[PDB]
């Protein structure tokens, strides 16, 4: 029933510190999950940045949880104790020694994937996978643009390439050209701040995958879309964006929200990622580094994912 | 003192059939590391030994050289490795990896990177290091160079991944048209050349800075040499059983060279492993149970795997009846 982790005790500071708490006992349909790794996504950074008003005073962040089933209720049939499992994010998150969830919320973590590199698949991976699949951008030949080479974006590139798409990375960090092209497999690299290159790419893209969490302008991006092209909104900005009616109507173009859910689809994504050997490029960090990573994350100073090592790094205060 | 062990061995070199086998290993010396084997990759050298192509091999033969495991005992003088650490074995240095455990001098034992899958990471220890070291030793690691990879198998598909992470432009030369999508979209190759397309072959003459030949069967190298620019390098990485036909004219007139692999240097192997960790490079593997090993061998002889068999020894190896 007892548990421990790292928590933000003061919403104004956002600083994480050790916290002990207690968890519900394993019910008849629940699954015991020993947490080995938890990925750090933007939602965690935002919650630490005091951007979610509905937050509870002690905040344990982390949504990309890969773990080991170590106990199951009597009615749990799919999951077995000892199995490497991961939790789709549908009270206390993943920066803890263990968690408990209804068996329906647990997915089997594929044999062939690293649990550390595979953990950001459970939020970033399914988001990219679901958006591309639901919107029918999975077809070999399509030219797609990925806006923002962050955590979500760099995974979007890998899924897009494994779908057989041509991928252009649209970013504001010129130093990332080699990572995008050689490290992630992108076919092209477009500098957002180069209107000359930008104007050359007008009407070239079948679809755009927007992973940014800042407001930014979408009108210059929409102009990169061919007629009837699709603009996939995957990032969740705190503010809202300014839809320019003129560029959208003229062009038959559409903006589609990311229904990145459907835990059954999440399992399909995991099996897809297993077949194509897709994981995130990860930086495994100790929990005592979490606050430094938070400031590195806010400044984009990471190579596309922080993953906290619950395995060897959470030490038990009590 | 000596520790009993079990695995699968070829008891009759003439048939090449593997079956359960009991044996014994030396006790842990002061510099040794006992390793519980989790995964063993299957390489071509394993297939060749099973096909009885090495006359100097002693039998019963337990094959397998791409070993990832957990250290379970260390000698008193061993400080680098600690019990419980995920480790990997150098292929350089009687009974191989298709067994429940092995023991090795600490100098041959490598730290297995946190970020790599132990199953997908196991072929790095023979196929990975071969590609990595050959590219590094011969100076084909420079962003911009155009390299061709001959043969999209276990070695070849890893060569492409390392080449792309080095920043090279990579053309895959194959005789399997169905492999075009994996090569270009799945592995990141910039082009796919059909060896048997005289139009494509003649169009690529003199375009390649280097060639990485991974094939293990006998084949002609003259048309491949012709794809090389002047002073180009032909890296021979596969080990055919028969000998190859060196055409003197294409080589001499081109100033071209054929370079052997020498994929060793455990220090280089750790460099490769850390490199593979930073760039998230693993093999595309098919995890199989040990009792499937004979069927996997015959699939392997025909190249019917995408792209590496890895035996789940941890969960699948049981002792002979006992």
Numbering used by the authors:
A (entry chain A): 12 to 101, 136 to 363
B (entry chain B): 10 to 102, 136 to 364
Published text:
pmcAlcohol dehydrogenases (ADHs EC 1.1.1.1) are NAD(P)H‐dependent medium‐chain oxidoreductases found in all kingdoms of life. These enzymes typically catalyse the reversible reduction of aldehydes or ketones to the corresponding alcohol.
The recently discovered DPAS reduces the substrate precondylocarpine acetate to yield an initial, unstable product, which is hypothesised to be dihydroprecondylocarpine acetate. We report four crystal structures of apo‐ and substrate‐bound DPAS from two phylogenetically related species. Although electron density for the structural zinc ion was clearly observed in all TiDPAS2 structures (the CrDPAS structure lacked electron density for this region), surprisingly, the substrate pocket lacked electron density at the expected site of the catalytic zinc. The lack of the catalytic zinc in DPAS is substantiated by the observation that two of the conserved catalytic zinc coordinating residues are mutated (His74Met and Cys168Ser). To investigate the catalytic mechanism of CrDPAS, we performed site directed mutagenesis of key residues involved in coordination of the catalytic zinc and the proton relay. A DPAS mutant in which the zinc ion coordinating residues were restored (Met74His, Ser168Cys) still reduced precondylocarpine acetate.
